Design an enzyme around this catalytic site. Structure first.
Site, PDB file in Angstrom:
ATOM      1  N   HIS A  61       0.800  -1.226   0.000  1.00 28.43           N
ATOM      2  CA  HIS A  61       0.000   0.000   0.000  1.00 28.43           C
ATOM      3  C   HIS A  61       0.828   1.268   0.000  1.00 28.43           C
ATOM      4  CE1 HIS A  61       0.372  -0.013   4.507  1.00 28.43           C
ATOM      5  NE2 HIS A  61       0.240  -1.315   4.328  1.00 28.43           N
ATOM      6  N   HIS A  91       6.569   6.840   5.840  1.00 26.20           N
ATOM      7  CA  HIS A  91       6.060   6.379   4.556  1.00 26.20           C
ATOM      8  C   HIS A  91       5.398   7.569   3.867  1.00 26.20           C
ATOM      9  CE1 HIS A  91       2.593   6.094   7.270  1.00 26.20           C
ATOM     10  NE2 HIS A  91       1.920   6.488   6.200  1.00 26.20           N
ATOM     11  N   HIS A  93       2.209   8.952   0.887  1.00 24.76           N
ATOM     12  CA  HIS A  93       1.024   8.782   0.057  1.00 24.76           C
ATOM     13  C   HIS A  93       1.184   9.722  -1.128  1.00 24.76           C
ATOM     14  CE1 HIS A  93      -1.072   6.769   3.465  1.00 24.76           C
ATOM     15  NE2 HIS A  93      -0.304   7.576   4.175  1.00 24.76           N
ATOM     16  N   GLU A 103      -3.247  13.328   1.678  1.00 22.38           N
ATOM     17  CA  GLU A 103      -4.398  12.888   2.450  1.00 22.38           C
ATOM     18  C   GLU A 103      -5.088  14.089   3.089  1.00 22.38           C
ATOM     19  OE1 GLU A 103      -3.028   9.302   4.677  1.00 22.38           O
ATOM     20  OE2 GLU A 103      -4.173   8.440   3.025  1.00 22.38           O
ATOM     21  N   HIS A 116       4.430  10.884   6.088  1.00 20.42           N
ATOM     22  CA  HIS A 116       3.988  10.616   7.453  1.00 20.42           C
ATOM     23  C   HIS A 116       5.145  10.009   8.231  1.00 20.42           C
ATOM     24  CE1 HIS A 116      -0.478  10.391   6.096  1.00 20.42           C
ATOM     25  NE2 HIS A 116      -0.057  11.628   6.290  1.00 20.42           N
ATOM     26  N   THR A 195      -4.898   6.527   8.821  1.00 22.08           N
ATOM     27  CA  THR A 195      -5.594   6.747   7.553  1.00 22.08           C
ATOM     28  C   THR A 195      -5.683   5.492   6.703  1.00 22.08           C
ATOM     29  OG1 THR A 195      -3.697   7.370   6.219  1.00 22.08           O
ATOM     30  CG2 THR A 195      -4.767   9.144   7.484  1.00 22.08           C
TER      31      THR A 195
HETATM   32  N1  N7S Z   1      -1.102   6.613   7.231  1.00 21.54           N
HETATM   33  S1  N7S Z   1      -0.908   6.772   8.866  1.00 21.54           S
HETATM   34  O1  N7S Z   1      -2.251   7.249   9.509  1.00 21.54           O
HETATM   35  O2  N7S Z   1       0.341   7.659   9.162  1.00 21.54           O
HETATM   36  C1  N7S Z   1      -0.560   5.206   9.643  1.00 21.54           C
HETATM   37  C2  N7S Z   1       0.400   5.175  10.636  1.00 21.54           C
HETATM   38  C3  N7S Z   1       0.694   3.982  11.278  1.00 21.54           C
HETATM   39  C4  N7S Z   1       0.015   2.837  10.911  1.00 21.54           C
HETATM   40  O3  N7S Z   1       0.317   1.639  11.564  1.00 21.54           O
HETATM   41  C5  N7S Z   1      -0.947   2.887   9.905  1.00 21.54           C
HETATM   42  N2  N7S Z   1      -1.690   1.723   9.479  1.00 21.54           N
HETATM   43  C6  N7S Z   1      -0.997   0.594   8.899  1.00 21.54           C
HETATM   44  O4  N7S Z   1       0.185   0.603   8.782  1.00 21.54           O
HETATM   45  N3  N7S Z   1      -1.773  -0.552   8.472  1.00 21.54           N
HETATM   46  C7  N7S Z   1      -1.084  -1.698   7.894  1.00 21.54           C
HETATM   47  C8  N7S Z   1      -2.043  -2.854   7.595  1.00 21.54           C
HETATM   48  C9  N7S Z   1      -2.513  -3.598   8.847  1.00 21.54           C
HETATM   49  C10 N7S Z   1      -4.016  -3.432   9.065  1.00 21.54           C
HETATM   50  O5  N7S Z   1      -4.580  -4.640   9.497  1.00 21.54           O
HETATM   51  C11 N7S Z   1      -1.249   4.076   9.268  1.00 21.54           C
HETATM   52 ZN    ZN Z   2       0.198   7.549   6.183  1.00 19.69          ZN
END
Ligand code: N7S
Ligand code: ZN
Length: 257
Positions: A61, A91, A93, A103, A116, A195
């Site tokens: 993703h 990471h 977007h 975002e 982020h 997000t």
């Molecule tokens: N974009 S963010 O708000 O900075 C953000 C910061 C830290 C996070 O851990 C996530 N979410 C994530 O990494 N999900 C991975 C798939 C597992 C779900 O089952 C999003």
């Molecule tokens: Zn993010």
């Protein structure tokens, strides 16, 4: 499984993650005239001098750079935060075109990308416990616009060809995240969520007012990554952003007049 396509994208996520329709979801549109200056907000303290990057990974993703978070090496403090938050990963977007990709939006304006930097509150001991708390994470969000190159981004850009497809990772030691920050640390802040799934409502968002500039060649390399794994039909990793969500009963605060 969730994604960013027509049949598994953000409009579908609530079916597996019903908190998607919750009271403090992210991202949001930042209405700059409605945000309130809060003079009690402290300056941000970014202490990245001892950061230890480990790996860079395509997770299907986004791509992320992971850090050693077993000691207070790279921490975020101050601002709206109580206590110390350790940097875990960063990471991005981004979009298929320069007019979309962020975002958060600012007066409905979308930037070409958003960085982020993800931190967790050390009082909770590990990130898995922190995500279950309303003040568990702090994410520093930085907008990217297309113009002049960002020299501190080039080491990331040059390794992306080695992690083209989902699941690929590479050693990525000695990267200095200070090279990704703009000059000013003026910011907006509000309580929100992850997000991406699981969309947990655990984040204090800190969104910097000043974007960084990256070159067209730099962002084009982001757009050559793949959502798919090796040996699968190729789907370019573009438009991996969630749209703005309802602000509901929240106020955005500004650190600056
Ligand atoms: N974009 S963010 O708000 O900075 C953000 C910061 C830290 C996070 O851990 C996530 N979410 C994530 O990494 N999900 C991975 C798939 C597992 C779900 O089952 C999003
Ligand atoms: Zn993010």
């Amino acid at each position: 499984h969730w994604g960013y396509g027509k049949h598994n994208g953000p409009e579908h996520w609530h079916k597996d993650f019903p908190i998607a329709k919750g009271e403090r979801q992210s991202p949001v549109d930042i209405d700059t005239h409605t945000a309130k200056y809060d003079p009690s907000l402290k300056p941000l303290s970014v202490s990245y001098d001892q950061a230890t990057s480990l790996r860079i990974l395509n997770n299907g993703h986004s791509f992320q750079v992971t850090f050693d978070d077993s000691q207070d090496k790279a921490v975020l403090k101050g601002g709206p935060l109580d206590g110390t938050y350790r940097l875990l990963q960063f990471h991005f977007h981004w979009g298929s075109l320069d007019g979309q990709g962020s975002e958060h939006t600012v007066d409905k304006k979308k930037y070409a990308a958003e960085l982020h930097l993800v931190h967790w509150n050390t009082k909770y001991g590990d990130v898995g416990k922190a995500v279950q708390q309303p003040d568990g994470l702090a994410v520093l969000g930085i907008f990217l616009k297309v113009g002049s190159a960002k020299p501190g981004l080039q080491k990331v850009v040059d390794v992306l060809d080695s992690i083209k497809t989902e699941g690929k990772s590479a050693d990525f030691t000695n990267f200095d995240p200070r090279g990704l920050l703009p000059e000013s640390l003026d910011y907006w802040t509000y309580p929100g969520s992850l997000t991406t799934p699981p969309l947990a409502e655990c984040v204090t968002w800190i969104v910097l007012k000043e974007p960084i500039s990256v070159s067209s060649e730099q962002v084009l390399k982001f757009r050559k990554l793949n959502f798919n794994g090796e040996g699968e039909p190729e789907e370019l990793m573009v438009d991996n952003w969630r749209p703005a969500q309802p602000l509901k009963n929240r106020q955005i605060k500004a650190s600056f007049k």
